[PDB]
Amino acid sequence: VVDPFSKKDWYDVKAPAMFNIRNIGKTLVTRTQGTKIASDGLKGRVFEVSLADLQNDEVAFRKFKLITEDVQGKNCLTNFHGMDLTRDKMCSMVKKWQTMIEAHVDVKTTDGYLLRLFCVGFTKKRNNQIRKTSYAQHQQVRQIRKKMMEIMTREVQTNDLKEVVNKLIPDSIGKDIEKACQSIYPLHDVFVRKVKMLKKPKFELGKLMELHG
Amino acid sequence: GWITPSNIKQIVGCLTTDFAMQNVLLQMGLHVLAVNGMLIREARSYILRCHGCFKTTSDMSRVFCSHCGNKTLKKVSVTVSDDGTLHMHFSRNPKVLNPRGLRYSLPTPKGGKYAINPHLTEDQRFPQLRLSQKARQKTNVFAPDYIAGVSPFVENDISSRSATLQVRDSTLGAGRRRLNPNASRKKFVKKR
Amino acid sequence: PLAKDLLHPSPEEEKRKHKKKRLVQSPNSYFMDVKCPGCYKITTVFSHAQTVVLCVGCSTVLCQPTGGKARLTEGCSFRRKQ
Amino acid sequence: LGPQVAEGENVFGVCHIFASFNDTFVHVTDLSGKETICRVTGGMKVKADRDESSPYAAMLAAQDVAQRCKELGITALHIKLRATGGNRTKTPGPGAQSALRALARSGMKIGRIEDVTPIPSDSTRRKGGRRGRRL
Amino acid sequence: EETRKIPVPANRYTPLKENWMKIFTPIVEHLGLQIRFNLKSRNVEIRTCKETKDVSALTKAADFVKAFILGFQVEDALALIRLDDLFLESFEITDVKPLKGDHLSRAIGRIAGKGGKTKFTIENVTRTRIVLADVKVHILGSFQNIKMARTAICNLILGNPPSKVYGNIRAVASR
RNA sequence: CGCAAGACGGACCAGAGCGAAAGCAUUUGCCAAGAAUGUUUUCAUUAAUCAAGAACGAAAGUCGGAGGUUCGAAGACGAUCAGAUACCGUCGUAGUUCCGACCAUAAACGAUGCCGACCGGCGAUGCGGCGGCGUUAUUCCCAUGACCCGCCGGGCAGCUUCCGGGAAACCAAAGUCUUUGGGUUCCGGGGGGAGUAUGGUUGCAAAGCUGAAACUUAAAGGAAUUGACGGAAGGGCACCACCA
Ligand SMILES: [Zn+2]
């Protein structure tokens, strides 16, 4: 009986200021049906946006996640929520005759955003290596896992999100660990494979306004 | 560097596409042309120098040497100008300069109709082992005279004694030749 | 094959073998003679040393115990006792 | 009615192609995914449960939603292609691979092909026995 | 201009360099598409152009360069460009029955046969073409030709000898 | 998009490693063990194999508790066939999970006791050590890792071979055996009856360990070789086949 898309509306998603592109798509929202507010039904959605759909000089085997927190007259003013890699890239990296090394740390930001960072780094066959295998002994792996736990402990702790996200976008963190682990066992593809989001502060409007402009 | 589908045709003198022909010309200082109507200035190709007896041949097809007869030919890239400035990138990298997978014991020399000696020289008399012509041929699936009859692929040869002796293509399985003999093969393989 | 004088082996081979498996057992370690540069005192340390040989008047480590041979410290040379 | 957008600028959506062994789903959503735009099940078209997981039933579902997609201004799609995963098979079937090629020619601008299959790291007991099951 | 990209493993790299006229020519000519192999990401990546005629000239080009990555022969992969409905179904060899150790490696011996004779047979009688990776079984054919390619494949790798499989194909191949 | 409960630790995962054997794969910390390598440290025959006896012992099973996601013997349903209570699917108890006791069997396998000696090669790999031109850790100062070449020792494995064996298949041990003796433990005597009966013993039970005879029978069995026939499939030929 009822054609429901006459009862809809159309909002715009707009990225925060770390990225070149801001308006990156649409999002359907049913209007206020008296009781439930149309802004209320929008207030928590996540957006699995890639990298080259946000910053143009960049390779898009990475992703980001973004919360429509505020509804300000047909704009989704959008926060940072999380980060992970493309599963095709993940399945591409895990070869056989090398070693997978991981670590995970729970770090706070300076502004109350509790993060859980992950790390993935692989051993690297040398450019004169003849042995098919490139494995690190288990104590070498516990060394490398500690610096992986060390480097991304300080950098979220020292900073806030607007500086942390900017470290994520060229993966400034993972390029540090690559140089910092050459002396133990040379690594190959060291990334922050995934970043979770554990807790948030009380919500601040003007923090988000300054996070856009 | 894309392809941008025009560039396949963009990939007094002479018109030779053989580098053994093109090498001798520019060392005299003889500017020639090609199917490209412009003259030649750059000659980029590959030759094979014997790592054993230091003997370069312009042939890229052979894998055994012409002077010493070993498998010590290695890939050598050249760059020849119109004047004939021979400057050759000898790849100084010990992944190629390597004695690793080079010593292994060989089976007894076997003589018979179906013996397979492990291809040492370029001309020792192998027995005539050939594929059956109903197996050796692939599909010319381009050709539109194609609809009538059999399955959408080539029929596999399960009948002949070319298949029972497991005769394979000499080009097929070449990546297993590059594997060193003394390695960790899986416990249920058997090659040729 | 089949023709080897075991009375007279070649010494490089005899150096190459495991120390118990020679014709007659001759071990591989020796005595180095540690000359610490800071002091003047000649100290004699075993080549495959275990736990730390200190300097007497200087309280200075001359060697650290690794697996097979001991590692010296910086600048401390040695002279092999013939 | 809908996205009042200039013509060089696409209005992306997200299409969920769920494969099974009994049917295939085609499911066009928001970029968030919380609203879907239209869900046409692969066993809505063919009235034969034998043919419910057909490539042909996949074509008929995907043509009837790119009709509905183009109806509502969605000119482009990011495709989250999906198996059943978990304990059972991990790779999406040809009935998912069919509907992909179906709404490619139907005028939808196809962007990123995404493999969202539920994969376990380490799962519970397989539904089959120790002896095996036909698959 | 829209594009597709698709990865490569390291054992499938050297087949591309051996076949970079034969994968090269039909994509660029018969479909009007542009093809690269990004070595900094090691992916094969094609895009459309102005000379791209068909709307789905790209989609059936991706599956051709997918099937070559999945180990299929070059010529036998070419018909994905041409024929309207060829497909592929991929397997985990342990998705049917939990083999392991050498009981896993004897599933490969049954499903290959001596000299490939069992693989060569099921391709002939079920109008398909299959490729065995280690834990992975990839089949390529029509849908009903696929649906009775899995069952000859599934029933080799839960115990039955090839002769009971050879008999039980042709009772279904009659229809 | 959240919340919860329990199991699981894929890919990495290798003819790699460890453990007496069953067996063992998320990080971190703690608790004690262990081989191998290194030794110009110590004791100076302290040993090898082992009836009695003892610890551990896959899965399933039995009692208590706790926990009950997945899967699931039994059981209850619903379905194609001349026949089916079977090959199917839906649920699903016990169990699969943790803790405390029992229980002691497996195609527990290398279907191959343990210790020692001798007897052909060849590289690869795991761990430790030794030596060395080189390249990278931003070079460099020595470090120390990461690779690279070689050597030693003990490992898991290969590959090779007219060593010698073997009924042969095959084995570098299954060799050094009529030219028969290094030391030592368990254990077989044509095939069934039968691992049954009875007795003893352990256990709550299930069962485990030990274990016959009367009687019956001319074979049973092992390797290797040729066919036959296919309700097995394809290639070649034929107007006693087909197409036109
Ligand atoms: Zn030569």
Domain boundaries, chain A: 6-213
Q: Beta-carbon neighbour count of residue A113 at 10 Å?
A: 19
Place of tokens 């800071």: C38
Report which residue type is found at D30: D
Does chain D reach chain E with at least 3 CB pairs under 8 Å?
A: yes
Q: CB count, 10 Å around CB of D92?
A: 24
- Nearest alpha carbon to residue E14 among B71, B173, A90, B186: B173
What's the token pair of residue D29? Answer: 């959503």
**D84 reaches E (C-beta below 8 A):** no
Contacts of D113 in chain E (CB under 8 A): 4
Q: Which residues form the domain of C39?
A: 1-82
Q: Are strands D109-115 and D76-82 parallel, antiparallel or unpaired?
A: parallel
What angle in degrees, to the nearest 10, is found between the helix axes of E117-125 and E101-112?
A: 50
Instruction: Identify the sign of the CA torsion A135, A140, A144, A146.
Output: positive
Backbone angles phi, psi at B171, to 5 degrees: -80, -25
Residue type, D17: I
d(CA A124, CA A182): 10
The contact set of E with A (CB < 8 A) is 7, 9-10, 41-42
- Contact assessment for residue E138 and residue E90, using Cβ atoms and an 8 Å cutoff: yes
Q: How was this structure determined?
A: cryo-EM
Residues 6+ apart with CB under 8 A from A131: none
The two structure tokens encoding residue E129: 């073409």
Q: Are B13 and B33 in contact (CB under 8 A)?
A: yes
Please classify residue A188 by burial: count the beta carbons closer than 10 Å to its beta carbon, then call 0-12 exposed, 13-18 middle and 19+ buried. middle
Residue E171 has which token pair? 């009772």
Record: contact A132-B183, CB cut-off 8 A: yes
> Which residue type does A84 have?
D
CA C3 to chain centre: 35
DSSP label of A4: G
- C39 labelled binding-site residue: yes
CB A170 within 8 Å of CB A160: no
Report whether D16 contacts D37 (CB < 8 A).
no
Residue carrying structure tokens 């995934």: A194
Q: Yes or no: say if E27 and E63 are a contact pair by the CB < 8 Å rule.
A: no
φ, ψ dihedrals at E99, nearest 5°: -85, 155
CA distance B73 to B60: 10
CA A127 to chain centroid, in Å, comes to 32
Provide the sign of the torsion angle of the four alpha carbons E114, E120, E123, E124, taken in this order.
Answer: negative
Give the distance (Å) from ligand 1 centre to CA of residue B64. 8
> CA–C1' distance D124–F66 (Å)?
22
Half-sphere exposure of B13 (CA within 13 A, CB side): 17
What is the SS3 string spanning E147-167? HCCHHHHHCCCCCCCHHHHHH
For chain E, the maximum distance between any two Cα atoms, rounded to a whole number of angstroms, is 55
Is C63 annotated as a binding-site member?
no
Q: Tokens 């401390």 — which residue?
A: C76
Beta pairing, strands B56-57 & E43-47: unpaired
What is the DSSP pairing of strand A100-108 with strand A114-122?
Answer: antiparallel
Gap between the Cα atoms of E155 and E167, Å rounded: 12
Residue D134 to residue E147: CA distance in whole angstroms: 12
Between the CA of D45 and the centroid of ligand 1 the distance, in Å, is 70
C-alpha A192/C-alpha C58 separation (Å) is: 50
Pair D18, D24: CB distance under 8 Å: yes
Which residue pairs from A140-147 have beta carbons closer than 8 angstroms and sit at least 24 positions apart in sequence? A140/A184, A140/A185, A141/A99, A141/A101, A141/A185, A143/A184, A144/A101, A144/A181, A144/A184, A144/A185, A144/A187, A145/A101, A145/A102, A145/A103, A146/A103, A147/A177, A147/A180, A147/A181, A147/A184
**Distance (Å, rounded) from C-alpha E97 to C-alpha E109?**
16
Distance (Å) of CA D109 to CA B33, D39, E34, E35? 46, 19, 18, 20
- Cα(D10)–Cα(D112) distance, integer angstroms: 14
Interchain contact, D134 vs E89, CB within 8 Å? no
Query: How far in angstroms lies nucleotide F18's C1' from the CA of residue A143?
Result: 22
Radius of gyration of chain E (CA): 18
Residues 6+ apart with CB under 8 A from E136: E90, E91, E92, E93
Question: Can you give the resolution of this entry in Å?
Answer: 3.1
Alpha-carbon gap, residue C77 to A108, rounded angstroms: 51
Q: How far apart are CA B41 and CA B48, in angstroms?
A: 22
Number of domains in chain C: 1
Q: Is E170 helix (H, G, I), strand (E, B) or coil?
A: helix
Q: List the structure tokens of B76.
A: 């050598």
- For B175, half-sphere exposure in the C-beta direction (CA atoms, 13 angstrom radius) is 9
Contacts B183 to A, Cβ<8 Å: 132
> Which of these, A101, A111, A188, lies nearest to A149 by C-alpha position?
A101
Task: For residue B44, give the 3-state DSSP assignment.
Answer: strand
State the Cα–Cα distance between residues E164 and C48, nearest whole angstrom: 69
Q: Which long-range contacts (CB under 8 A, 24 or more apart) does E155-160 make?
A: E155/D134, E156/E107, E156/E110, E156/E111, E156/E118, E157/E93, E157/E96, E157/E97, E157/E99, E157/E107, E157/E110, E157/E111, E158/D131, E158/D132, E158/D134, E158/E96, E158/E97, E159/D132
Integer angstrom CA distances of residue A61 from A158, B81, E6, E125: 27, 42, 12, 42
E143, containing H or E segment = helix E143-147
Residue E34: which of E20, E24, E22, E21 has the closest Cα? E24
Residues 6+ apart with CB under 8 A from C22: C14
One-letter amino acid identity for B160? S
Give Cα E147 to chain centroid, integer Å. Answer: 15
- The answer to whether the CB of D42 falls within 8 A of the CB of D34 is no
- Cα angle vertex C4, ends C1, C7, to 5°? 165
Count of other CB atoms within 10 angstroms of residue E55? 14
Q: Is D2 on the interface with A (CB under 8 A)?
A: yes
Name the β-bridge partners of D15.
D28, D79
Q: Can you tell me the distance from the alpha carbon of B122 to that of B124, in angstroms, rounded to the nearest whole number?
A: 6
Q: Is the CB of B77 under 7 A from strand F?
A: no
DSSP category for residue B152: S
- Strands C42-46, C31-35: pairing kind: antiparallel
What value does the CA radius of gyration of chain D take, rounded to a whole number of Å? 16
- The identity of residue E76, as a single letter, is D
Number of Cα atoms under 13 Å in the Cβ half of residue B19: 17
Q: DSSP string of B58-72?
A: S-SS--S-SSS-SS-
Amino acid at the residue D132: G
Report if CB D133 to strand F is under 7 Å: yes
Do A92 and E10 count as a contact with CB atoms less than 8 A apart?
no
Q: Are A64 and A166 in contact (CB under 8 A)?
A: no
Provide CB contacts within 8 A for B185, sequence distance 6+: none
Nearest-5° angle of CA C58, CA C63, CA C67?
A: 160
Contact of B40 with B51, CB cutoff 8 Å:
no
Contact A78, A47 (CB under 8 A): yes
In the beta sheet, which residues pair with residue A101? A121
Could you count the other beta carbons within 10 Å of the beta carbon of residue D15? Answer: 28
Contact C30, C47 (CB under 8 A): yes
Cβ within 8 Å of residue A68, ≥6 positions away = A13, A27, A42, A43, A44, A45, A47, A76, A77, A78, D32
Q: Is C55 annotated as a binding residue?
A: yes
Q: Is E101 exposed, middle or buried (0-12, 13-18, 19+ CB in 10 A)?
A: exposed
**Exposed/middle/buried for A152, CB within 10 Å: 0-12, 13-18, 19+?**
buried
- Residue A13 has which token pair? 């998603």
Using CA atoms, how far residue B9 sits from B3, B75, C40, E32, in Å, is 11, 27, 81, 14
Strand ranges (E), D7-122: 12-19, 24-29, 36-41, 76-82, 109-115
For strands D12-19 and C71-72, give the pairing: unpaired
Which tokens belong to C70? Answer: 């001991």
Residue of E11, E49, E108 lying closest to B5 (CB–CB)? E49
CA B173 to chain E, closest CA, distance in angstroms equals 11
**φ, ψ for residue A116, nearest 5 deg:** -120, 110
- Other Cβ atoms within 10 Å of A174 Cβ, number: 22
* Structure token digits, residue C60: 């200075």
Helix ranges (DSSP H) in chain B: 19-28, 133-136, 161-164, 174-178
Order of strands, sheet of A68-71, starting from the edge strand that comes earlier in the sequence: A23-30, A8-14, A76-78, A68-71
DSSP letter for each residue of E57-97: GTHHHHHHHHHTTTT--HHHHTHHHHSS--EEEEEETTSSS
- The answer to whether B14 is a known ligand-binding residue is no
